[PDB]
Amino acid sequence: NATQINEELYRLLEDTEILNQEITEGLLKGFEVPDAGVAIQLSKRDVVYPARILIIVLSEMWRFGLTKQSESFLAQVLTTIQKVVTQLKGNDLIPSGVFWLANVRELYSFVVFALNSILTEEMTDEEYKEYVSLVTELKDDFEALSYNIYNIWLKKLQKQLQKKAINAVVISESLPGFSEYTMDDILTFFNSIYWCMKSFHIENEVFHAVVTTLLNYVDAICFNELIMKRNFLSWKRGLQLNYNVTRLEEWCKTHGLTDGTECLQHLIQTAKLLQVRKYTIEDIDILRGICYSLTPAQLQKLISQYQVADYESPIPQEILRYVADIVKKEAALSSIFITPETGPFTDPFSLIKTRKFDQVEAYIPAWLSLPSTKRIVDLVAQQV
Numbered sequence: 180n181a182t183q184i185n186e187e188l189y190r191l192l193e194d195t196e197i198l199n200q201e202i203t204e205g206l207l208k209g210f211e212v213p214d215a216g217v218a219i220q221l222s223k224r225d226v227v228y229p230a231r232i233l234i235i236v237l238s239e240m241w242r243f244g245l246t247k248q249s250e251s252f253l254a255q256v257l258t259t260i261q262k263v264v265t266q267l268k269g270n271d272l273i274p275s276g277v278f279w280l281a282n283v284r285e286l287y288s289f290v291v292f293a294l295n296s297i298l299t300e301e302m303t304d305e306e307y308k309e310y311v312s313l314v315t316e317l318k319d320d321f322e323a324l325s326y327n328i329y330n331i332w333l334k335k336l337q338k339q340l341q342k343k344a345i346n347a348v349v350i351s352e353s354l355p356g357f358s359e360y361t362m363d364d365i366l367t368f369f370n371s372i373y374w375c376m377k378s379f380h381i382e383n384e385v386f387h388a389v390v391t392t393l394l395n396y397v398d399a400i401c402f403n404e405l406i407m408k409r410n411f412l413s414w415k416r417g418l419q420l421n422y423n424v425t426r427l428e429e430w431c432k433t434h435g436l437t438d439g440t441e442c443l444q445h446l447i448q449t450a451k452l453l454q455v456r457k458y459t460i461e462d463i464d465i466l467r468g469i470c471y472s473l474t475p476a477q478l479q480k481l482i483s484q485y486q487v488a489d490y491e492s493p494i495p496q497e498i499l500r501y502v503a504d505i506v507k508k509e510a511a512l513s514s515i516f517i518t519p520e521t522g523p524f525t526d527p528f529s530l531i532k533t534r535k536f537d538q539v540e541a542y543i544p545a546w547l548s549l550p551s552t553k554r555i556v557d558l559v560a561q562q563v
């Protein structure tokens with residue numbers, strides 16, 4: 180009976196005390212991410228199950244005109260999701276962050292869809308006014324949420340790289356003995372971003388933005404460490420740096436990026452500088468063309484700090500003064516560090532068309548224990 184289903188639905192939805200607690204503590208804070216990787220085939224419903232559940236609840240509240248209940252519910256949802264992303268850390272950081280990006284994108288896409296449906300197809304006409312106004316604000320709130328959690332997450336990713344990439348790129352020996360975190364750890368990290376985004380059906384533009392931002396970041400912070408080191412830069416260190424950096428560049432090539440080489444140019448060009456001949460004037464003129472991303476002052480620091488090995492010819496004084504003169508020259512034509520980009524960053528989701536919404540069957544997973552929420556979804560499902 181439609182009326183009995185409607186009455187029961189109505190009482191479930193007006194009882195926001197019980198419902199908000201279920202949603203915020205059980206569904207949102209209690210989220211479980213599905214597995215990601217090469218042999219994994221996830222349906223979209225396994226990835227965005229929290230968003231789809233929220234969408235069912237939300238729309239039922241609107242259908243019954245529980246506009247005040249929806250506002251209460253939504254404020255809790257917005258706060259909780261942002262809070263959840265703020266608390267992400269450790270091994271879970273990449274999959275949980277991508278998970279929440281997917282879900283907030285699904286929510287935002289729904290609201291965009293609902294707003295267009297309201298304006299196009301659709302009890303006081305002044306209540307309708309307040310309604311359009313509510314959904315419009317909700318669209319802005321989810322846009323802000325997406326931006327916020329994208330930036331919160333991306334900053335946490337940068338810090339994990341500040342922690343690992345410097346040791347892996349600059350310090351760890353690709354050739355042990357030649358001269359904690361290794362390039363393998365760095366590759367694992369970027370692979371995890373790749374496979375979580377792939378498996379969780381994330382739009383490729385977003386993958387491009389995230390990884391380009393992080394590669395530029397690795398480039399800046401590792402370069403800055405390298406250029407301060409005064410008893411370290413040498414041919415051997417250059418060969419090892421080459422092997423570390425090339426591995427990251429080759430990963431970029433097989434994982435959809437064509438601009439990875441451009442993001443790593445300061446590291447790549449430093450490795451070259453550390454390896455090529457630095458003995459004649461022409462050597463230096465050639466080196467300048469190879470190192471087109473390095474300033475003369477940077478060339479000078481790197482060259483003047485270069486450490487010759489036993490049986491290796493010293494860099495001649497003639498060449499050191501040539502370089503110093505190129506620096507004093509270009510100075511007379513009016514930092515050595517690269518400023519790391521720390522944001523905030525444009526939300527790459529905001530640049531692409533939203534998910535066109537096809538109405539999907541009411542579904543709520545099995546490990547969940549959400550009595551009211553599950554009854555709502557079951558009752559909605561019965562009306563179909």
Ligand SMILES: [Cl-]
Binds near residue numbers: 216274374375
């Ligand atoms: Cl992973």
